[model samples]
Target chain A: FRKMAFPSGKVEGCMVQVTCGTTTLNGLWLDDVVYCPRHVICTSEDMLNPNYEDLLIRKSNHNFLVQAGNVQLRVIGHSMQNCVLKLRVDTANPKTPKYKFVRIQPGQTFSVLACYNGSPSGVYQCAMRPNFTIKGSFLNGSCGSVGFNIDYDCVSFCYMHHMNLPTGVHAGTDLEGNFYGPFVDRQTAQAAGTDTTITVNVLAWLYAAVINGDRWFLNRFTTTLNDFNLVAMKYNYEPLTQDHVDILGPLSAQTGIAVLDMCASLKELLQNGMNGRTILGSALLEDEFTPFDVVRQCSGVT
Target chain B: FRKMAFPSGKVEGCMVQVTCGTTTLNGLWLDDVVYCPRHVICTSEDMLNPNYEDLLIRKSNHNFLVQAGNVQLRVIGHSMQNCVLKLRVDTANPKTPKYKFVRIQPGQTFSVLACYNGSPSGVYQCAMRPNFTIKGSFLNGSCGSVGFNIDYDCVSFCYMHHMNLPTGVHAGTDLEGNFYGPFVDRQTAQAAGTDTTITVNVLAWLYAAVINGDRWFLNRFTTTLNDFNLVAMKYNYEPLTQDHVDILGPLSAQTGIAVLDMCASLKELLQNGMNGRTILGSALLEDEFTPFDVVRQCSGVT
Candidate 1:
């Protein structure tokens, strides 16, 4: 269920090549990473001009070799953009040192092997030295990121396709300064099991729009988020029940003035930067709280 | 804090008059019963045309006299219509027997005295017989009703004036065939403390309209019911909080298609005749239930 794609082009004077056993895909690149029904090798190659920033592997779960001609190579977890690679060994017991790494860099062969043991517990890292002493282990880090920024999660295009989410909608930023999206489906997002801050970001956007008297966000809340089920699953939050629609359905159809007036009054009580995680997390999970209770805290009531 | 009003007209060849002490207002009538700053007699009178159905008393707390000439007179509690007037005494106690009457008719003076002792516990009733034997007590019944129908509470015009509810919105009927109207304020409705089935009926209308894809009911829900606070108090139900507005406000602003589709899907799960009393009562009061839980039951999900 894992897949990877590398954008074709020269990164810092290095031509990248992906090899699978005896077969070699030269200058391999793809428009975007895709979900394969089974194992398949595809590449995007463009050597006429150097136009790429970094060698990107969209997703992966198998050990594979990636080689570069003359450029330094670095392999980081999907969400670890600025991950530091180093090797440390514990020799106090006079046995082989237990080394754990969170980032990986190229070796003498100019090739890096990307691998996964199906453990979603944490991120993996590694580094190399003259003795070829290697340090690798799983640790906590961002699961997705935009650009070189390492404070978000990656929502694959495949995810958006399956969920029917419009690709045009940009990502959202949470109160904690983490970005989320491009957006993904419930199953894909859940399988990643990374920090699903996007749920909070989406909720923040929804409430922010409401507080600002943006009526259009009402439909977006249901249609885009599948009544919040998609995002809820990302955080293992409770999805809205039929009662939510029953109560909120009619409310979402009110006149502009009515909604505006309601928002005005509500904003007076609800505080700013309503954190989606807090509202959708324990606030929703606990029986003592209602949507009212959530907003009360959103307004900094509790 | 109760006041009464008698429309000035001839009903079935009877001239109605209201007297307070020695000061008798001849042909007394009023445009409508009003909340008085102090005890004062106002009447609505028109001798040219015998127009009017029942002689209406808006609200009353103290004993008052109502008289009619050559006309049969019946005095019932605010919401009691078609109440049976009778007098019965039990001699089993060998003392003054305890008998409760729920209605009253005029005596030899062609007048009936309306009275209240500040007991909101229940409705009061009385009947007369020979030897001046009288039976009176309080019982359960409707609080607000429209016209000759007796199955609802009375939302006084004064109550409506205070609450700022549109006087023209008419009454609503419940699943039980009870009619509730004109409308009243929270304080007044709570003060009466009779059966507040109007809350259920109003909620029923709101849900029914939503299920039928009628978007207009959204505004009516908040504006008319004061975010359900007014009706909530009618039955000692919990009023909606800022959370409800926070969630429902945006929902109430959705486009027609969004709301319609939502309602269509919801109606499939939600059963007909959504009882407001039940939803706003135990369903809201209980911690185990949410707005979702309530709707689940509304859909016959138990």
Candidate 2:
């Protein structure tokens, strides 16, 4: 037999010498014996094979693999900083290893290692699968907590859907049709599955916009989000969730519905030519009657 | 000889006695020798006559009349509380007295008095001619100064035109299609002719709305007024005047353009289905780019 190395840098065979009756015999030997000091390896062939037994292990101290009487292989513990490893074992039927897939979340560091003849050959950085894209306005403040490894990509799009975000995450949108964070801490983000959620954190966005003096952003975001919420409630029959209420409650309280309704009325007025040549009359009447009072009354606010 | 009293209670013809050569003569005499206390008189016939001279006077402490050699009649100052009087004198062409018309504005009181043979008769209150109808919202505060005798009539009409008001007058409109103040003091209103003027006082209206917590009214009025202003400027080639600037300047400063632009953008977004279902992407991009900064830059603000 001859020694061979897989593309994964995993060497399975080695040269061995045996002596019988004073006659020395040299031969190539292949066995389950392999060692990697700092990394884990899996061959390309093993990845393609459906029946390949893959072992997954979380990083810890005192990592070792033990074989019991040629019947079972147990991986006890492994050590790697902020990383997880997968090991593929290609043994015959009786000795086939049972393995489980290890899940890695955002904010977790992961790396892959290749071994050759019981020594580490190569180490590679591993990234999460199916990269996520977060969008919205006034999100810069919260982006740092989401474990994004790349700079923000400024694109033109509007995320109108409600993101039932996990607790501790807040998001919002801007006037230029942009969506922003369901900002989450690493701890909370780990609990979230690999699914994209779009949420409107009106309070957060409003606060940021106000602080930045971005009134346009504030108005547009609020108006748009409110309209979207209304539509959702009307058509989908989706009652506002706790998350929605939490995000929008303070917004409505601070800005007041009168202002929002006024925006709508203004749009109507513009469409009607300020009441079709009766602009002055309409304006006068408005001043005298104070329509906003009626709105407040109808809205059940004092 | 007998005395005759006209319907106005003015005794024009009086009984007279004349002695000639120890003989007593009595006759009916009608002359300019009429006396009236705290009143003035004019006959219906004198009012009908086109060539009649009508005497006009401002109120003063002492008032008297003098006839100079049956050729001219000079009327001196008269006293009345917040009132002006008109005296019609019907005399022959050569003996006709020249008179001038006295103009009375609002906030002034005047009474008409009928006299009979130098005795006070009937007094009738006089009002300003061509009653003015002031309309608009938030006008209750300023209406008092303009000398309106009636309570606010909450009419439903829009006065779109600009009222080139005199100094100290301001006006605005409300969301309920009402127009209000071009509030004016009596002095300023006096300078304003009888022609009805519709003015928009955005500042006063806004102040009231804010104080009243009428956010809806505030938003609608501002939006409508701004749009109207823009339209006037575009179609009529009318630039914003000192009045417009004075009214809208503080508004823009206080609320900021960002908020206004945001309202417009919100309308557009609602029309577009939150960017046709790409809401998330658009929102994200907006948060990252901060389009309001661009607006501020374009608007030439810090």
Candidate 3:
């Protein structure tokens, strides 16, 4: 199953993809892959007593249940401890045993989907066994159990939705210079088109912004790029791409995005008419790496 | 303790547990479950810059010691931010201000344990500072600070024993159509007979294999069940159970048991099996519900 799902452990440790003709959705890859057990072999006290001679402390067992609605029962283990839980569903037949048994070990969490329709009324009956080793002993049983009454939905539309790629300006990178992304809604996926394929004219825009030294635009632009890069990495995603800067530039733009908007502003102040010459070489790179605000063209320092 | 364990509302959140019983242990229950703190608030710069705000990214004030063997030091964070830790270990001569305060965090690999006999070679002195805001501050003012070193005997046969589950094949379910489990080793508790008791008829020859598996098998098997369940849920365990059928049927085969083989195998198989199923379900599930996998399965082209 692992072999088939991953097909090949390429790119990252594991990969998953959904194809649609040439276009496809591929992500949620696993990196730094290491296979180890779920929990350490000691009891809760041993977990606390450091003297429990030779312990692995793998991970603890934990469990939770999710209804189809907005209500959820997230029963997780603290630190890494094993657990045996006896949970009875209130909606279950009174005469029949609708009791569910859950066992979680160190470093593990038991999760599953349970009750409810689109409606918001649901109930739960659960009890965590007092001692997992007492065999079937469910101490206090019913008396010790707790109840949960649901009103608002547990599974929200937004919660389920964001599990996939987020909406509006999604981006990624390979931690190298390589980058791939962008799915802008209600904007242009065209102006950034290319004869080969659609690639944002990052250079054209940056060259323009840099040349114009659009302080208001540059500050936010660079910060957004770096932040986008950082945020993506922070969450373990890839990194940023040129389209990220391209799209963000226009989205946060306070002025104009037209070719002449800023250069025209620069035209008014230019010592002479502009020619698209020295602009191609290092002249274009003049302020490329520096903060957009620090660029001398607009510093007016002189 | 919960207050001390979870000092700040950052990263993963607060964690703890309690226990009683000779051979019994069960926890992983939730009260507010909400006791777990939320992630910190900061931009990429603030995260990058320690002075982002008057923030104290507390280390959840955790404590653990390292013995010489399969023992380990799993100093981790609940939140996703890379932390700068300030810790203290109790290693000085108690008469004086006997305590070793070590400054860590921000690129120092957190360390502590390994393996050894039930001897006193182990000394755990740890203090997750009361505040992460202090920056490189180790409060105790201990007199000495060195590093760690282990011996060959540390990785001896004893070191390996602690790696797997300490019990029998345990199974669990949430009654939401979601089930979880573990174990298959040579060691046994007896034959499978339920009129009075159910037991495993592990063939003595394979019993060796099973026992080896019990040791080797137990560590990973239980850990697998627990970890499998954990990873699945952590990712919203809703991937694959049917295909779990796809791979597991083949896995439990190579080593066979007779009448107990299926049930015993099923016992070992299922405890370990449900884990495999949940894992593959998600693994096989990687592309399962997504457009392509869903389309192919639903296309009914066959």
Candidate 4:
């Protein structure tokens, strides 16, 4: 596994850091929660985006990463010791074996330390806590459980498209479209000769170009996640979280479904450039309002 | 779904409840962290069994549930609320969508309330809790992030198994023998049409009779389990668990791969009950691995 880094940030996974009263956000919890200094992004490179550098960080925000139309950076948080860290696989399997260890000692901050996966199409995840030190975030009471701190230890599915990373991530896990369990036979999403002839090519090109795992998770993964991303989308996953606890209520609030529902309501506002999807007669109807023959066929209405 | 009864010892899906304790056991960390309960048990119904009755509770001095044995039961020393729960449809694709739920309650008094399985094959499992509550057993107060607590809105499998009590079972989900994702595909150690036929039948019967959701999970269902009277086997289930910490652990212990392993072991043990195999094996040399061959086979000589 590649040890993740936050170049200019603290030992935590976040990129930026705040010293005194910067009042920045803490972590970014999404499909894979990442600890950032003061930014909110869904991907590792979100804050590093040069396109929207200034807009991302709050002028004196003490940030590390920046991106176009996105603000980010990590801030101070706590890490306890002796806390039991139970790691799990990231994929959908729930019964996969897990390994638990403790944060016996502390040193320079870091993202995931290491991982072990002897699984087939299964994912790996890690949940940590500040309780390891018998220490407290506020320096008084002992730390508490970090709940389910997790992220993709490694992705099994390599984009049919995006192969390189901003940092030039080399040949990923030999998974050229081999992640989702193997099948003796494989056909396109639809029949080979269907409109997929065009769709497949388009998707193939999209796959080739859009190399980020997040993008693929949205595009290739089933609609189940269609809702999850839509949820995390709303948090904007920057350094700060909106105080929306009234609705989600902490732990349950971070679930993909909750985020999706939140994203649903904020879709109109989130897709400022109309990046997500706009509705028409139905949800994905593109433009027309009244039921048009083109809309029906285009939407797979039949 | 039918509301199941806990106190009543039943085994709806070809399984039964032999013993239930007063608490639940959350899984261990990286290594095997065992749960030492305030009480350990030997029998469930009375002190005397046709075989080994009332020997446990009467042993006179063991008051806790932590007397390590071939199997272990724990009532989760951590707060179980916020723990994770997972479900599988027999042994289908592990990704086949087993619903994962969070524990929002406390642990129950009984260690394992039920032991029932869904219909599907290759679904053997071992699940753990990222967050679970514990009381005094495991490194007291070491339950990390998972709020390990007394289980409440707990599990439902074992109680269901106990509900099914008696009745021979059959294989195949819905009976057509669509055994499940991997049953029909299990490569046996030996083929049929010989003395090994029993082994073959063991494998086959296990495939069809148990998995496939063929039998009703909880509640009362027909079909006796593997002809091996469950009453004869020894088991212990404490809690369905503080739901989140996982309800399947104990359930699997009672019937998962452990069960298969036990059955296989039991069969091999019975391999001795036949008593005299030398003459029989020498007579049927080519047709099968005769009793003599079995002895030789076990002894590792040509």
Candidate 2, B38-151: lDDT as tens digits: 112222333333221232233222233322223333333322221212211233223222221233332122222212222121222222222222221111111111111111
lDDT of each: 0.23, 0.24, 0.21, 0.20
Off by over 4 Å in 3: A1-10, A14-252, A255-259, A263-282, A285-302, B1-83, B86-302
lDDT of 3 by residue, B1-302 (tens): 00000001111011121111111111111121111111122233443344412443432424322111232223232222122112222221121211122333211111111111211111111111111111111111110111111111121000001011122112111111111122111223322211111111112222333412332222222223333443444433322233333333332344443222332332343344333232211111111122111121122111
Segments of candidate 4 deviating more than 4 angstroms: A1-50, A62-302, B1-40, B43-57, B63-302
Worst window of 10 by summed lDDT in candidate 1 chain B: B1-10
Which parts of model 2 have CA positions greater than 4 angstroms off?
Answer: A1-40, A49-197, A217-227, A230-242, A248-302, B1-302
**For all the predictions, what are the DockQ values?**
0.01, 0.00, 0.01, 0.01
Q: How far out, in Å, is residue A155 in model 1?
A: 28
> Candidate 2 chain B: worst 10 consecutive residues by lDDT?
B1-10
Residue range A137-222, candidate 2, lDDT tens digits = 11111111111111111111111111224332333222111233332212223233343212222222333233223343222323
Worst 10 residues of 2 chain A by lDDT: A1-10
Give the TM-score (vs. native) of candidate 4: 0.19
Backbone clashes in each candidate structure, one number apiece? 42, 80, 55, 136
lDDT of 1 by residue, B90-201 (tens): 1111111121112221111011111111101111111121112222211111111111101112211211001111211122222122222332212222121122222222
* Candidates sorted by lDDT, best first: 2, 1, 3, 4
Fraction of true contacts retained by every candidate, in order, equals 0.00, 0.00, 0.00, 0.00
